[PDB]
Amino acid sequence: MGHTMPAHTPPAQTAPAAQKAGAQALPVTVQGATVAAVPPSIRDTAAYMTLTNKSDQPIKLVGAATPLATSPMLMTTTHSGGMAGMKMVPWLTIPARGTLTLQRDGDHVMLMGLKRPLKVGETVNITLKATDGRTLNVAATVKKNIEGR
Ligand SMILES: [Cu+]
Questions:
Q1: Ligand 1 centroid vs 83 CA: distance in angstroms?
Q2: Which regions are flagged for Low complexity bias (predicted)?
Q3: 33-149 maps to which CATH number?
């Protein structure tokens, strides 16, 4: 039509790269979970991962169910993650900007009470459950990673 494309006009950027840009929303855990094959600290263990928020909404993740650990307990001791308490919290709400790093003693999930023997290099499914109404299946890679450190 003049400049009615097609096309957009658009592209001085600003269709971007859309595609996807405009975002829609990216469900705020574009992460490949890893779980530590038995630490030198009894069967109990944790996930080693990072929640990567790309939506900026107050999401509340409160599940980490898996044929791995019996007692999946949420924990939070990083002053930018959930909280400052390495304790069995409710869960961790990510008040937008959930760019927190789940590490053994710096906010995490304690996948406590290991059921069955694990191989460093295996992979077991995890089903997370945010009470925003998510029930998301993810592949969790079973390897200790920088442990006995
Ligand atoms: Cu912990």
A1: 12
A2: 4-20
A3: 2.60.40.1890
